[PDB]
Chains A and B, each alone.
Chain A
């Protein structure tokens, strides 16, 4: 938890910085192959040993975010051409 950040700065803040916090570490899937062993060295970065390979990890959560849509939308246009 926070409290890490001890009783100092209020609440709402802690809250948030906990939201992104528990999320700042421990992923959790194979963007290559194997098991849960990636993360996010800082920001952008996020490599994984069960391959020993780095993925372009999102921010405070190496999970792309809006690239959900992109996941679709992007590769989705790949539909046309060639269906």
Chain B
């Protein structure tokens, strides 16, 4: 009934207990894709190794701070006056931040599509 906060709210829902991560939704190009941008900037460990009905692709070890909770979010705007603003979601300007936006092109990160002046949807936000 909503694969996003579904699983990011299990990582989130986990590291607060503290541990070595667990299973999740089913896979999703998108799940796996956030469960990438995450690793690729740090935070999480190694996306994992399942394969079933749609249960396929991965589990995913924890590691590190990653505190706290991946951000799930449930709207979608972007660019210029935007992105910067919804960068108020962030846990503080001075670096730290990361807002896993959805960018017309690419499921990208607050900066990772700040990149080639991109924009669009607001998929989430990490640490």
Question: Do A and B come into direct contact in the complex, CB within 8 Å?
Answer: no
